[PDB]
Amino acid sequence: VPSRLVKNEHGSWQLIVNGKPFIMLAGELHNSSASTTEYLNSLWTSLKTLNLNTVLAPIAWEQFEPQEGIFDYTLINNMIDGARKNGFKLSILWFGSWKNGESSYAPTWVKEDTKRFFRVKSVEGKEIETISPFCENAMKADAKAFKTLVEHIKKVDQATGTVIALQPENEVGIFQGMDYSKASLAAYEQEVPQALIQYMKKNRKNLRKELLSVWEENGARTSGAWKTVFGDNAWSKSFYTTWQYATYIDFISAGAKEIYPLPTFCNCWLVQKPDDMPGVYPNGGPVSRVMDIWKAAAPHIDVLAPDIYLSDFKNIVADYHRADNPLLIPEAVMKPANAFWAFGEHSALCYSPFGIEDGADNFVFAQSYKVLNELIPLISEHQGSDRMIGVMKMPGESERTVTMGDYQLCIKYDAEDAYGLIIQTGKNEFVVAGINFKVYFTSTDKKKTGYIKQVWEGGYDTDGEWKATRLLNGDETYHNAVLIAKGRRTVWSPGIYRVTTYLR
Amino acid sequence: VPSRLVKNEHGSWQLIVNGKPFIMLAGELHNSSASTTEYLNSLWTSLKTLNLNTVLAPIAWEQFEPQEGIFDYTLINNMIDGARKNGFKLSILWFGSWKNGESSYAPTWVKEDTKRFFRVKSVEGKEIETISPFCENAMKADAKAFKTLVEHIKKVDQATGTVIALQPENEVGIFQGMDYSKASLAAYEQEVPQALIQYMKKNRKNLRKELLSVWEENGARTSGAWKTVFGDNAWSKSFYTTWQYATYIDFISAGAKEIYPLPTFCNCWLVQKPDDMPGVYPNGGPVSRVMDIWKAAAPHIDVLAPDIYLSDFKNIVADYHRADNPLLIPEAVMKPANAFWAFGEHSALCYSPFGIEDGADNFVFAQSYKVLNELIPLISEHQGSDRMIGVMKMPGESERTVTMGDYQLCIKYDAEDAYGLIIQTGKNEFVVAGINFKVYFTSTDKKKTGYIKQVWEGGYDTDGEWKATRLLNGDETYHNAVLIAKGRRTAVWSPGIYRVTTYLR
Amino acid sequence: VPSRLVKNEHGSWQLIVNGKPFIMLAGELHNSSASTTEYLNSLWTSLKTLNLNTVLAPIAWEQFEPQEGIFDYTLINNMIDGARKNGFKLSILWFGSWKNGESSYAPTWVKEDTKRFFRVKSVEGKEIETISPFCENAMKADAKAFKTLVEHIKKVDQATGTVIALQPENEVGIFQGMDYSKASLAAYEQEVPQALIQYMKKNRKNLRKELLSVWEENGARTSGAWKTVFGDNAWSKSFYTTWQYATYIDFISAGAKEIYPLPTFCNCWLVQKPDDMPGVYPNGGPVSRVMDIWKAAAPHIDVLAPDIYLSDFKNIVADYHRADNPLLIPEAVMKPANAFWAFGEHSALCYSPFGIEDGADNFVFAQSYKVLNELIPLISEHQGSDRMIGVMKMPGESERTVTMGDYQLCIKYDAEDAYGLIIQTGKNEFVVAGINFKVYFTSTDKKKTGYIKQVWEGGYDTDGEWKATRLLNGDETYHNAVLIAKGRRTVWSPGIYRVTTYLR
Amino acid sequence: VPSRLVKNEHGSWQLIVNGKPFIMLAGELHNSSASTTEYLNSLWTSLKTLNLNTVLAPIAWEQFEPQEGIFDYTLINNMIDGARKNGFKLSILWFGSWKNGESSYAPTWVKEDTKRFFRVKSVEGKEIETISPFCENAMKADAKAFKTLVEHIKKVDQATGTVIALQPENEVGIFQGMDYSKASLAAYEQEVPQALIQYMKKNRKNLRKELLSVWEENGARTSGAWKTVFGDNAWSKSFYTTWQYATYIDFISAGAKEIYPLPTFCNCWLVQKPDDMPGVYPNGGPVSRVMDIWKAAAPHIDVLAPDIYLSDFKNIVADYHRADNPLLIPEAVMKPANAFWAFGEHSALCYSPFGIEDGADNFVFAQSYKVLNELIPLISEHQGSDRMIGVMKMPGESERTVTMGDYQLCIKYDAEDAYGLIIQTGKNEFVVAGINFKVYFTSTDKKKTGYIKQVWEGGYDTDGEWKATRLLNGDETYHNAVLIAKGRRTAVWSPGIYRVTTYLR
Ligand SMILES: CO[C@@H]1O[C@H](CO)[C@H](O)[C@H](O)[C@H]1O
Ligand SMILES: CO[C@@H]1O[C@H](CO)[C@H](O)[C@H](O)[C@H]1O
């Protein structure tokens, strides 16, 4: 296959594409934006101005399988064609059974057969516009459509590998404590799957404290029905709902993996506020609180990916990034600092603003992606090392201090909007990328004096070669007292600086 | 003739032009804008940017017959020529005896002979710059010129049918309780015409209350003079005055109908405020109050057409639209909402901003006519049906609910400027056009659940074929919970067209 | 001669240029703008945008005769060349002995010899930078150079007639009660010239009150010395000073008139405020108060021309326009209303904003001159008749009524900037030009009703033929209740309207 | 050599370049702007828009000698090439041992050997990022590199003379009362050099009060150690530190002078506030207070050059301009007034805004340089004479009166931004350049009346010939009552040039 996840020396998962480490400098289209060839083709030139390397775009089951057994390849065909013509990779979004909790993208022949494909019921007994995750018939229909899609992708793309990742469904779950369908209620009375029990026992010291505390509160039992093992409460309800989602979607993914395995991720509508109970957000989705349940249930799903529109970016990304879960953000705000923090601090696979086609005039973002592209080789090389960090000022922070081998780095912010990344490339050498901050280098060991030796501003050409534009000294470095990450000038955007240091 | 009104199966009057249903997406020029070939010709390109299909433009008697029996075809010729070259149909306004009550467009030779063509007199006795509607000499001279104009149009236009309608005179009436000319004072004493009596008897249940009440108050008599049948008051004065105008102009139209019958309408300066008495507005004009009088008196006038510049649009158009009177608005404000309301709610024949050449920079208006043009086939097919409605928010309204077959539609407004139309094209299919509203779809039968099935955005190509630009879903329909008529986007927004399918479960 | 003043049938003086009535739609250059060929030549395209037919431009003695007996024809020749090439007539301003009272344009060799060309002396005995009008040497040297200039103009322009008028000196006079030079003091003691006395006797009825009153206060004597005849005061001082200036300058003009007679005018710095005594303004210059002295002393000067920069435009022009003195305004503000008033109300020969080259972006002014040009034939034909008026609103006015044959015209203003002119061209026909006013037509005879019959908007083409652009009616004339002079549209400027009227 | 300092008849030092007097209408690049060929080459077109005749740009030892004995001529070669292609002369800044006090441009191989190239030590005893001026190894290595640079310049530029001046180091000195290195402390105990005693003896009447008063307070001794001759205090510490810097840098210049002598200047960071003690500003630098020490110690340095960023411009330039020290300003604000004052009042060799490449859209400054270029021959001819003054208004001044032979010039300002220069070219002739002032000419001798005779506005063509654009008179001169220096117009305004003839009567 031409896209794969491989763990490196530092234990970081890396995307390897056409043989090389690859980071998704991405954007996701608006939902409806891949729904005709003409609309989508109107967007490519805009997207190129933002220096994307990857576009996240949906295929909708309703359009792909408009009658059961009849498949329409027009949209996937034209999407791959356009991506190729414009220099983009694709992550394909599969709007099948569920998109933002609901089943609005299910085919007309699925919506109209509520007997074959039964709906979630509310606590009031109302059927809603959401297929039950307890509907086996819907699992199989969706699984067959998705497998057919991926078979086709293999058939037209196995060599070029334009398509580098798959997202089955979109923000799954219910806005309810549980499904009140008959199958849902019976499933709630069933034995906890041993797969979950075994996973927990094994990974206890590492479990989410949301799972652990409920399990332990009820005696950390290794058998029994859901209400025995996890109590009769909102949490046991969320846990068997999430199991069911993860199990249904795993089946969908397995069918594809069997024929053409690509990096596969499921995305979540975040727990918006800390007190929110399951059902305020989609109950069933891969939010961090149930990461363990998803991992135990869905081994054919590679990454649980947060959709981040909230300002608390640093805490959110640390919450979702685990040793078994690389940071992959398929939906975010169009804020360059977020990208630098994800890639630099957490070795992210993907950063993707939602509704990217709308932000074509965002020069600073475009230039930021340009700088990140220059740095992909160096970022890739240091993924997972303690020699790479992000830089992003949040309100009310004034400075950050870190150790890097022989040196202490004191990062001070010159504006609210200050961001970048720092890589130690050598005992006495650093690459600093970004804008509106300064870095002071001193000696860890206080029996020595550490100082900047020399600073060059530059960038990497299309060959990947470093080309210095200036040797920054004098006013530009306060006589080598400090690195000033002023940025590249046209308006200001992130710059790249090579700093050599010395001890004496 | 290449233009005619035909009633369809729902009872609605349609304009058939060159053998196809036609709706006037119109504009009327300022009054003096067709007075030379050069000035008119300077406007065509401006008008084209507005996506007009029809231009309303005057021929003035003073220019058409500058000396008695001498006719100048220069202006009508070049008007037709320009419309053809720029893709417009024409409705011709005839500024003859009267324009805005007065006779400023009568030929020099008519103005100068106050013996042959006597004037209205005021209550203090002064002759005003208005030819009396009791002056038979004026009626015949006007009729002969109008007839001469229409013969010419036939002669140069019978095969092409650039000209699709005629408006004899413009906003007729006097700013007086009555004319005080000796001939007027005599007329008022005369017997009420049996045509009026018989009309009232036969059409009683549909009569205006302003006429029925006065008739009824004076004993609903079936003979007698004006003052006997209608009392001695301002209303009987308005009635015999209105009868007079309708009679005079009917003759002018009939001469034209005899040789080249075109759809013909007369237009009114509205009763401007609800208490206004005849004379505050032109007394004699076809305001809704005297609609039955005009109908009884002028069978050669097809349509009485309101000139709407007031903000109370919905009430006004509902007042003028009757079984026997299609909605045709030759003068209006340049407001896209108004057009959508007239065409969608009332199946109108015409919507026409006055002074249209001034609005060439109104992109939202332009794109509104663009969308309406795409919809003419569909509008025309649903005229008079309960399966077509307008949408237009007015201040202080928040939402409208209607039933369409198996579905309830709740229309909710997302801004003050919200307008469009809705057409049910199938048991489970709707076309919704417009901007700044939302439509919630539910089952009429409470035992079932109705939902949106699928939503497409698009438009009709030049071949008249539907082309979807998107399948709107997810964010764009709140996951099929609602239709969002956000509009077509250039940001600036103008009306969009959405095809919505629904289902029951 | 290609230019001459000729009294028409109504007693109005007209300029006949190349055998046709001509009206100067003029502007005057800044003082230093014709001092080189290059600087003047840079202006002509600007001037053309303003639709001038005439430029007022100086020739400076200092440059024309830089050494005595040596004449430099460069500036005059290039000026005429440029005018011809750009479609302009010229009125030549002679900056000789005096310009704004002073002698700053006298040649170096005149300035440097205060023995030969003695200066004015102040009451304190200081010699000022003004040559004395009692210095005959200066008079003869000025006259000789001026004659040399006009002779040259004849030799290069007699057939073409680019030059249509001359202005000897500029705003002459002293900022003193009298000149205190020896010659001035002796001149004051002398007998009143018999030419003055006889002028006053013959024209007594029509004399300026300012001259009559002083004469009559002292016995209306027909002989005696200046202080005998006019008493010992500021006025007698002003009179003999004014007599001196007009005599000196009459000699200069006479020399030119002898070989090549052109319409000749002297311009004044106005009495700025009503109380102002002679010498607050240049004492000697042709202000209206001393118009009779100038007329008596200077028959070779055709017109006395006010320079009008003050806002009391209408009273000022009325004060200068007399039966023996056509209105000619060589210096003014760039206000189109003033032009329309001068030409329409007072049959003026010339309207000329000062510093015209500054005004090249004045669209409204330029279009005003376009309209006046279209109107020149019609204006010409009605000069001095009671069938032509101007229209100009001043603050605090709002309507003018006038009678014209059978009709009363009520002119009502729709804005503060309201101006134009009205010509009755027939018993029942009028041409109205202008902007921001309305005209109501009624019958003078109350037994009749007068009304507008028909209105056309239009203009005159380059052949002088009327071309209508619209028949205005309906909204555009309130159904013939009124003529609306709305203007030509692009921003609005004066329009031209033909109105027929009728009586019933 | 194609660039030389030479004293004229009025005792003024002039720069003679390619046989002709030359004034630097200059600008200095940002520090890092000459660090690659690509970055510098991106600037030339911009620099041309400002009408510079000279660029000040650095060469950095760290790049010129990247390893000891290995020399990289890329940057100097490219700089000379670009200067030639764009019509500029160069003054080369040597960022060697010190730049703004510190050793940040010293080679990596100098930085890393603190044994061979020992550092300044603080009073606390810390070694700082500054090479001690008491380090002979450092002096020798800097000297060797500097000579290599200049030998190369000779080798590629001896005929053309693009390079017209040299600045060794940049704003040298320590932010300390003294260096606490062992060498420094022991040099403080040494005998005052006789070269300094002798200078102070010979030049006593012309000494800086700052040096003289301290010498005299300790008994004006002609022998002893620093603390003997100058006391034990901050000043004797400043004196010997300054001696050391000037001595070190003189050695550096001498090596260049011996193979290819060019006008050489050292620049100083100014005493920023009058109370400031040595060390607040760089202690060692050629500030005016220690001008005598620098002259005595460094005969191979031609000029001491102030870097002027402060608003008190007139006082500062007067402070630095002495008979033995022409005014040369390598670093200044981009203010045209400062240029006119420097060149006009003080016959300056050079005016140079710092960060010049940032200033490319400064039209008025570009036009001022255009006018100064036009005037260079006339400025050159009157350098040092009392027939040439500058004009510059400072806040809270309103007029300046000067005597010029037979006339008195009253200069009155019409705006806050009023500047230029005045030359008497003849007994009765002046050239006035500038903007926003007026000049009144009267007679010195009150028994005569002096007046303007004629005024011409104009300029000098590419051949150096005067061409009048106007004879100014009437309103333009208030009838020759005054010269109005209105400026050249474009309305945006910049300096004009006016020729005024006067006369006495
Ligand atoms: C309507 O979109 C959804 O909004 C939610 C908050 O209400 C979350 O942000 C989800 O990620 C997003 O897909
Ligand atoms: C002056 O125009 C007229 O104005 C009236 C109100 O005054 C009505 O609006 C008429 O319809 C309109 O034609």
Numbering used by the authors:
A (entry chain B), C (entry chain A): 20 to 509, 537 to 550
B (entry chain D), D (entry chain C): 20 to 509, 536 to 550
The authors write:
In this study, we identify a β-galactosidase with novel substrate specificity from Bacteroides xylanisolvens, an intestinal bacterium. The gene encoding the Bxy_22780 protein in the GH35 family is a component of a gene cluster containing SusC-like and SusD-like proteins. In this study, we found that Bxy_22780 specifically hydrolyzes β-1,2-galactooligosaccharides. We propose β-1,2-galactooligosaccharide galactohydrolase as a systematic name and β-1,2-galactosidase as an accepted name for Bxy_22780.
To learn more about the binding modes of the natural substrates determined above, the ligand-free enzyme structure of the E350G mutant and the complex structures of the WT enzyme with galactose and methyl β-galactopyranoside (MeβGal) were determined at resolutions of 1.91, 1.86, and 1.94 Å, respectively. In the WT-MeβGal complex, the electron density of MeβGal was clearly observed only at subsite +1. MeβGal is firmly recognized by Bxy_22780. In MeβGal, the 2- and 3-hydroxy groups form hydrogen bonds with Asn119 and Glu190, and its 3- and 4-hydroxy groups form water-mediated hydrogen bonds with the main chain atoms in Leu289, Gln291, Asp326, and Tyr328. The indole ring of Trp288 hydrophobically interacts with the six-membered ring in MeβGal. The 2-hydroxy group of MeβGal is oriented toward subsite −1 and is located close to an anomeric hydroxy group in the superimposed galactose molecule at subsite −1. Moreover, Glu190, a putative acid/base residue, interacts with the 2-hydroxy group of MeβGal. The methyl group in MeβGal faces the solvent, which is consistent with the result that Bxy_22780 acts on β-1,2-Gal3. Thus, the complex structure suggests that orientations of 2-, 3-, and 4-hydroxy groups and the orientation of the pyranose ring determine the substrate specificity of Bxy_22780.
